């Protein structure tokens, strides 16, 4: 592991310093269907006409990115994504830009969001949830080791692949930072107390978010929920959590340590780092190496009928792609 990561850091650093640029054109792909939507764009299932391969192309409208002040975060997303490589992270295949937009072509993950399956199903059994959690544990260990913070863990950002394994997408808030950071980022339900309290934070927020994930998967709902974000923020800083009556003891205690308001008592941020988590009783049966190798028994395989099948995804109105006669935000995105 330490040995593995050491090699890993070397590869990441090479790419970090020398990021790739404009590795394709819009006209090499065939736009097929929107798989998901956002604020400054949408993700489309596309087909590389020369190869016959399918990918998920994220399209960002430069003006909306600027209007929303997300330039640096956008630069971070692409720079980080092209440099990382782990089994549970989406692969960025190509990236390019044009007069109007920024494009990130990634590997198409056919299984759909964890969110949609969790919703339909209700809740996952502890064993099922642990299968998923362990993958996020290995991913954060990999990411943090590279001085990166993810900052947006939630079911919507976890995709299930053909093998029933996880693929973490959406690196729009990911940041390589040595030391504290201050941006108010993320999704309300998953926000750490330090973030809502505007105090400057680190990696420990990723470990709080993990606690929120495991809990939502196992119970079917988030530990703190209300109808408006402020009511949620209130609950989070309250430092009070109620556990469903079906949570195992090992789970109630793993969760009490992950959802530790006091980040000097929060697992993942302690003396033994991630080991405090891997060595926890709830994970006693987990064979970390086996999971990393994907040689484990996936409890559920979403099944898709042939390539390009998008039935595990929701339908969205097709907003049409427009590209200006004039370059739009040249200097802001020159490194893209």
């Amino acid at each position: 592991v330490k040995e593995f990561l050491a090699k890993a850091k070397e590869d990441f650093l090479k790419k970090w310093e020398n990021p790739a640029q404009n590795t394709a054109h819009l006209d090499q792909f065939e736009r097929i269907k929107t798989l998901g939507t956002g604020s400054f764009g949408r993700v489309m299932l596309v087909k590389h006409m020369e190869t016959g391969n399918h990918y998920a192309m994220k399209i960002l409208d430069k003006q909306k990115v600027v209007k929303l002040k997300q330039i640096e975060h956008t630069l971070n997303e692409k720079r980080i994504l092209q440099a990382v490589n782990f089994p549970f992270l989406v692969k960025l295949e190509f990236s390019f830009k044009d007069n109007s937009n920024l494009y990130m072509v990634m590997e198409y993950v056919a299984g759909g969001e964890m969110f949609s399956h969790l919703r339909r199903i209700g809740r996952f059994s502890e064993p099922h949830a642990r299968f998923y959690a362990a993958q996020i544990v290995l991913t954060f260990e990999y990411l943090h080791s590279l001085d990166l913070i993810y900052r947006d863990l939630k079911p919507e950002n976890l995709l299930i692949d053909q093998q029933g394994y996880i693929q973490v997408t959406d690196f729009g808030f990911a940041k390589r930072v040595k030391g504290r950071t201050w941006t108010l980022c993320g999704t309300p339900e998953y926000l750490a107390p330090e973030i809502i309290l505007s105090k400057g934070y680190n990696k420990a927020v990723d470990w709080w978010a993990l606690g929120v994930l495991i809990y939502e998967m196992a119970a079917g709902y988030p530990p703190f929920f209300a109808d408006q974000p402020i009511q949620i923020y209130e609950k989070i800083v309250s430092g009070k959590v109620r556990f469903p009556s079906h949570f195992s003891s090992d789970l109630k205690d793993l969760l009490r340590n992950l959802l530790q308001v006091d980040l000097t008592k929060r697992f993942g941020n302690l003396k033994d780092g991630v080991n405090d988590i891997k060595n926890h009783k709830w994970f006693a049966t987990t064979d970390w190496i086996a999971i990393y190798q994907r040689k484990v028994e996936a409890p559920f395989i979403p099944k898709f009928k042939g390539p390009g099948d998008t039935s595990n995804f929701d339908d969205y109105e097709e907003e049409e792609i427009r590209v200006s006669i004039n370059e739009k935000c040249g200097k802001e995105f020159s490194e893209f």
Partner: peptide, 20 residues
């Protein structure tokens, strides 16, 4: 039950991230 309360709540769909 909490589950019922969550189901009747306004935040059961896909949650958007907060920027500014």
């Amino acid at each position: 039950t909490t589950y019922a309360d969550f189901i009747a709540s306004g935040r059961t769909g896909r949650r958007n991230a907060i920027h500014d």
